[PDB]
């Protein structure tokens, strides 16, 4: 019983409490932790490895599902319109909300006892983890139904299966385009983008597209970008009174806020017109996730950065220097050498005080401590792990949107004009959205434009 016990017995690997902890004064207590499911349980032959429950491809599986029974339950099958099922109890100003899930122990009901709003049901189980994530899932649900509705009027003989698949294929390509054209360049910076993601040529069936074990921990760099509040803005992009800056430890699993506190529009406005938190070597991750993660739905607040480190040990991941060696980067052995790699002798001294050797620094810890590459938000090690992963997902994907045969030349040219600000225009009541690049633009009104200036996806090439 990991949730409540401090005893180290499989499958529990609880995080112990150091002396003089700033929050947890009881040293007989602990931070709960379940070891990830082994791929080969009970074995004394195989070296323990972990499982990926999702498709590695950028195929909008967080929208459509990664298992066939769930994917059927996500669709509206009462007609031939190829739609995704929508919430039958509530609407967001006339617009669709995700269906509710039927969870035995629902954590969303714990966030507001009197509201009685359960978790949402989407392609991925974590959709209600924060209302900002729910907003993104809800936006893509509306985009699928909008696409299946336009395709039905354009091609009336197409049946529900054709309509679902054709709208699914477009949403998947949209997720690939936003990710590779707009998102990844801003993560890696220009030089690592050129190095790890050179111009796409064609599909290569010898490229292994699986997620590497280390990537599940290295991609947690995103924790350093998390702001301590959920920001909501009104029609004029001003704070939505009287709760415009709700602390993050009061939004985790708070599906009731989407349903009862103005829908997804105030949230999507806040994501667009509020800056991200910058990762600094002395300002790595906020206490809303470091001290109060899931506080309302659990016996104790969790430490997300500490869980990331315990998870890398649980996953048997090698240390900082082995990953530096894997990446073809120098491996510092003394405090002075680590100081030069990090351009920070003070941080290197503290890392040495904890670990003794740079060989033992946990991959997330070492990765997020590196100075940021120019025009990117990760350093040399993380850019290598992340770039290598994303190149394998693109080159090793037979259904990659630019692969010959996937879309027609005319369809590829129409898809090239998509953008996240335009998807917000089409599926929300928001009339003023960020200018491209949406991931850079963060100040209203300077970085904003009207819906009327951004052209919509032209589905003419999809006519049979």
């Amino acid at each position: 019983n990991c949730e409540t016990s401090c005893v180290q017995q499989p499958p529990c690997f609880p995080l112990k409490i150091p002396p003089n902890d700033p929050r947890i004064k009881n040293q007989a207590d602990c931070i709960p932790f379940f070891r990830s499911c082994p791929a080969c349980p009970g074995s004394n032959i195989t070296i323990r490895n972990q499982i990926n429950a999702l498709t590695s491809f950028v195929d909008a599986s967080m929208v459509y599902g990664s298992e066939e029974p769930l994917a059927r339950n996500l669709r509206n099958m009462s007609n031939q319109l190829g739609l995704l099922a929508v919430n039958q109890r509530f609407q967001d100003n006339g617009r669709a909300l995700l269906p509710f899930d039927n969870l035995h122990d629902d954590p969303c009901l714990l966030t507001n006892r009197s509201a009685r709003i359960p978790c949402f049901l989407a392609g991925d189980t974590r959709s209600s983890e924060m209302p900002e994530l729910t907003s993104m899932h809800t936006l893509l649900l509306r985009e699928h139904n909008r696409l299946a509705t336009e395709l039905k009027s354009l091609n009336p003989r197409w049946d529900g299966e054709r309509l679902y698949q054709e709208a699914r294929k477009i949403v998947g390509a949209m997720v690939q385009i936003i990710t590779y054209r707009d998102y990844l360049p801003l993560v890696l910076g220009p030089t690592a983008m050129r190095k790890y993601l050179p111009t796409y040529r064609s599909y290569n069936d010898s490229v292994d597209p699986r997620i590497a074990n280390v990537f599940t921990n290295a991609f947690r760099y995103g924790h350093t970008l998390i702001q301590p509040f959920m920001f909501r803005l009104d029609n004029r992009y001003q704070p939505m009174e009287p709760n415009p800056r709700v602390p993050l430890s009061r939004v985790f699993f708070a599906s009731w806020r989407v349903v009862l506190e103005g829908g997804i529009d105030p949230i999507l406005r806040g994501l667009m017109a509020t800056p991200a938190k910058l990762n600094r070597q002395n300002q790595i991750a906020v206490d809303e996730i470091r001290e109060r993660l899931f506080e309302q739905v659990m016996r104790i607040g969790l430490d997300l950065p500490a869980l990331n480190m315990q998870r890398s040990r649980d996953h048997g991941l090698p240390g900082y220097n082995a990953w530096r060696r894997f990446c073809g980067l120098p491996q510092p052995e003394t405090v002075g050498q680590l100081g030069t790699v990090l351009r920070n002798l003070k941080l290197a001294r503290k890392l040495m005080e904890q670990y003794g050797t740079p060989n033992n620094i946990d991959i997330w810890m070492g990765g997020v401590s590196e100075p940021l590459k120019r025009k990117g938000r990760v350093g040399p090690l993380l850019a290598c792990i992340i770039g290598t992963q994303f190149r394998k997902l693109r080159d090793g994907d037979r259904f990659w949107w630019e692969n010959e045969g996937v879309f027609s030349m005319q369809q590829r040219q129409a898809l090239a004009q998509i953008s996240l600000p335009r998807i917000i225009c089409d599926n929300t009541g928001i009339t003023t959205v960020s200018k491209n690049n949406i991931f850079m633009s963060n100040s209203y009104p300077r970085d904003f434009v009207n819906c009327s200036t951004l052209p919509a996806l032209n589905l003419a090439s999809w006519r049979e």
Binding site: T55, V58, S66, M130, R210, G319, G396, N442
Partner: protein
């Protein structure tokens, strides 16, 4: 794998015709380096009291977090060149790529 297909499967099966589970759901992660466990095959570093990792004591993950990650919330530095949508797309994208189940 059917010889001709127009759309992806839901599970990712049949994307790679020569190795049809590659990228498919509910499969073990690939490893880029061999795993490092206390006993070589199963126990994580930090499991057994007194067992050092490569010559040094294993540090408590919570102690690393307290001494390196911790910072005063009011001293947060906003990113002048990134929106909060940059963070949010990352989590949404992560949820398209991997989910590691626990018991």
């Amino acid at each position: 794998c059917p010889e001709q297909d127009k759309y992806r499967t839901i599970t990712g099966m049949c994307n790679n015709r020569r190795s049809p589970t590659l990228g498919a759901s509910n499969r073990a992660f690939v490893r880029w380096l061999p795993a490092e466990y206390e006993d070589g095959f199963s126990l994580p570093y930090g499991w057994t009291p007194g067992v050092k990792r490569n010559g040094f004591p294993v540090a408590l993950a919570r102690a690393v977090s307290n001494e390196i990650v911790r910072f005063p919330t009011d001293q947060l530095t906003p990113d002048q060149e990134r929106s909060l949508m940059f963070m949010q797309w990352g989590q949404l994208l992560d949820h398209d790529l991997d989910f590691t189940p626990e018991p």
